[PDB]
């Protein structure tokens, strides 16, 4: 594949990727158990605890009423004085120290009830997607973590990945998995993941090419070839990526997409320029211009090009049939009718919670009497 | 394009679309702080404030990690009765008093651990997919209002939008953002967001075109044309949509993909028909139906139609090789084999919380001896 | 259609697949209410009340502030022992007593702010989609489950569903809903939800076709074939998946995307092998092999293949083009360049809370002092 020769044929060189092709998964099997085991002094923490088991029901009862409805296509003088001490130790005795007895036990279960929540929150984190869609869920990061043990040397090493292919397949969400039985009394999840074994094809690069419109003789043309061609070593081919997952850096196929190239075709790739069948623009529209990268390629030389806040028209020098335009005059370019903006970069901001401060503990003093019993010994 | 021409080729209209051009996002930065600044008698909260930060560091440890493995990848008498008093006291000032004391600041921790929970929460819901997938997530409206400052004049005005992008825009989920760099121990995720750049092509109207069987001179024949065409003004070109983000109002390519047509083509959109490959049915299957928001096209005059729960059979008129279904009759079809509902109206629900009632706190009574005293003094 | 032909022409048969035509939606409004109803001694629970209707808050404005931005695209000695005794029953009465009775209350509100966090998680699971996203989100299970008062069987016979298309709608995300109004003091959602009526063509039926490499007089040649073919009963069709949603089961469209089959094709499918255009390979790269469920075909004839692990090469014992490869020999299998692993087996493991001890709570002792008392009487 030959670009200089293509350039001038209106053909400009577009995006690069890799080729892989995909395979069976490999399947492992985890449990998440949502209620935890408390125990301890039950009769303290009891109501707390029947609350949550309420709260982890109302979650998975949908789940198993799902799989049950989809079961055939789920997978798998001194006197007077001792009266009155008698009677403020009975108020002490009978009313103070019951209710503050009880208090203890409130707090306790208090503290269990706090637990617990969070201990939710961190399921509905990890495993949140598997609860919500019991069939085919995109797997989080957090659950893969636990499912390696959080190793992610061995993680590749089992998986036979390099991190080129734990960050696309990441990007992609190719980590899938489904829920295959639950126990609501229990509090149990059966979690099925299921994590893809990509093949590499040596050397199998993509090249995306981008025709524009450019002049020649006279009148417009547009030369016409597959957006996207193969080439391994020197040999090319077709391919058909509209059944394919497209990442930044690869092409990822279930099956070997490509197929026989004409010899007509290879020889424009090659730099023949021959045929190329090139058609005439009549009553057509056609683009003028190519966006790769945030790079913006046009025919200026057939349109009207403009900078803008420059205010300043765009202008080619010949000898080619494509210019790029520069990005460091202005953010908007006008091309034909159409304006185009880049990307600038915004200002830096932050999310967070407003600073919070304590008061003190309402505190008790001591009752001190000392002086006053000293006096009357 | 004239299609009171090609309604009598077996060619309905379809849905129309405005035609938009992807370019590079706009990048905006923002950090996520998921441990609060609480300060003020750390001595009295330290303990909730400990066990909440063990659930942070539980969800981020996982983000640091996959990080770490993708380094390279990731883009950026009197004695005797005081002696009873005095024992009194004791057991008060002892037993009683500490306890009181230790429940106040069990209160103060607890409330602060149901706080801190919270808190979590809000963020479990803004910036839960950034957590659970630290490379390509949706970004949700609660982040982005965030980065705004609860501002949408400022959004749209600063991207350019009109109430028509924003809405496409979220309806595609064309906001992402990653996860650049986190530090487990401070509990801050660094998460950059892109907002994509959309560019309309001024008149530029995708058609969707919809060939169904008709009878001629004899025997059955279907019209071949592309099922999308573009036109802006008064020119006619192919697009190739299979690539493109198709919502409800508008396709949205990256790059331009107007290709264009031929002469023929052109001939029979406009109204010649004098070509317009039509070809035989001798042995293959075709289409009878076509559906548009609803509505019910059919070739009722080579097939059997019937309106079903009305028991009544559908006729054709001549005139016409299609005729449009009226949904006011019955909200069942029966063309040919093919049973077709129509999307009915089903009553509306609630979801709640059942109503809570509290009881009353225990209330101690106050220790009344006024009228005994009285009578010793 | 007839395979066995088609075998010795390097055309491999792939997976199978159902045939739908997706309709209007049937719709469902349903109410959410985020702010539970709780009363009762209000001056007790007011506090943890007040913030949790800040968290509600928080969540819900920006849906608000999005929705009105989008207004015009949404849808819808007796004296002094009597003063110490009077003195101490003052410290009782005016510290003790009135700290106790606020720990009570402070008690029931933390207990109420449990509960309402609690409640939020509930719906943050089932209905976390809608409020992340106002615009196009898919519907969890919790919702279909409320939607329908927890009765699957009423969820199938209103919507004509059999156990089947509920699997493969789950699976593909099919049921999809948007909020249409919001009110934020109130703690309201509106949320409309979109069911999906789908159709099944009678007997239609379509079949992958895998084309690889092949030897013939001499040279190497490859088959051209559609990728997919329909057949219903005698008939056959091209069809164009590419605009269309794939599950393990069936290919669901909108319309119908069957076209005529030209002659020479249906001759190979239905067995002729006169014409089928063949391709020379001369400078192109093209496939050895084809997978299908796990099962790896290849042309081992042409190119050298290889048992991992067994150190075994592997050959064909003639009268075919195309060999099958055993799994049970090796898991990782070399074609040509090319490693093909198979999904292997990982073992079980789980994901728990640690298990949690509680210890019991400070218990006041009884004041006992009749045994002093009997001695001063
Ligand atoms: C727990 O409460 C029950 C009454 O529901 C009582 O019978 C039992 O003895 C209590 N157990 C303890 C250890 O307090
Ligand atoms: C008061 O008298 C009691 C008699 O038992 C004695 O124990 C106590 O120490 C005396 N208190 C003072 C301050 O002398
Ligand atoms: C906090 O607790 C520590 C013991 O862990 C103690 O040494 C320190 O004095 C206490 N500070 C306050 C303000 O109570
Ligand atoms: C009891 O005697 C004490 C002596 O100090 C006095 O202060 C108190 O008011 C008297 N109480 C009554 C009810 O007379
Ligand atoms: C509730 O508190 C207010 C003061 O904010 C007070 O006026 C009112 O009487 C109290 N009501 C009850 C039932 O305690
Ligand atoms: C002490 O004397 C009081 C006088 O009212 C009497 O009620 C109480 O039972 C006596 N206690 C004992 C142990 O005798």
């Avoid at 998440?32 to 709260?55: A, H, M, S």
């Avoid at 059966?190 to 690069?205: D, Q, R």
């Amino acid at each position: 594949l030959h670009y200089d020769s293509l350039s001038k044929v209106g053909i400009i060189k577009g995006l690069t990727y890799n080729y892989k092709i995909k395979g069976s998964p490999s399947t492992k099997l985890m449990v998440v158990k949502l209620i935890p085991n408390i125990d301890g002094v039950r009769n303290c923490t009891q109501k707390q605890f029947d609350e949550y088991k309420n709260l982890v029901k109302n979650v998975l009862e949908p789940v198993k009423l799902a799989l049950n409805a989809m079961l055939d296509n789920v997978k798998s003088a001194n006197k007077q004085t001792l009266a009155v001490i008698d009677t403020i130790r009975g108020e002490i005795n009978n009313n103070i120290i019951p209710v503050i007895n009880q208090l203890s036990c409130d707090t306790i279960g208090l503290s269990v009830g706090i637990k617990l929540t969070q201990y939710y929150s961190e399921i509905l984190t990890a495993f949140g997607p598997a609860l919500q869609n019991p069939v085919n869920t995109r797997i989080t990061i957090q659950a893969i973590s636990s499912v390696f043990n959080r190793n992610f040397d061995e993680l590749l090493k089992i998986m036979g990945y390099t991190s080129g292919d734990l960050y696309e397949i990441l990007h992609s969400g190719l980590i899938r998995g489904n829920i295959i039985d639950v126990d609501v009394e229990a509090g149990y999840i059966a979690l099925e993941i299921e994590f893809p074994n990509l093949t590499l094809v040596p050397n199998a690069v993509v090249q995306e090419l981008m025709p524009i419109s450019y002049n020649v003789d006279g009148d417009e043309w547009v030369t016409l070839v597959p957006r996207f061609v193969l080439t391994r070593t020197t040999l090319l081919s077709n391919i058909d990526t509209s059944r394919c997952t497209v990442t930044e850096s690869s092409v990822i196929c279930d099956n070997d997409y490509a197929l026989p190239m004409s010899y007509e075709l290879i020889g424009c790739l090659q730099g023949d320029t021959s045929k190329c069948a090139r058609e005439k623009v009549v009553s057509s529209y056609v683009p003028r211009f190519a966006l790769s990268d945030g790079l913006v390629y046009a025919n200026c030389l057939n349109t009207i090009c403009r900078c803008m806040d420059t205010d300043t028209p765009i202008s080619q020098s010949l000898g080619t049939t494509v210019s790029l335009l520069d990005n460091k005059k202005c953010l908007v370019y006008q091309v034909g009718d159409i304006l185009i903006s880049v990307g600038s970069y915004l200002g830096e901001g932050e999310y967070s919670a407003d600073n919070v401060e304590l008061g003190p503990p309402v505190v008790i003093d001591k009752i001190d009497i000392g002086n006053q019993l000293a006096g009357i010994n």
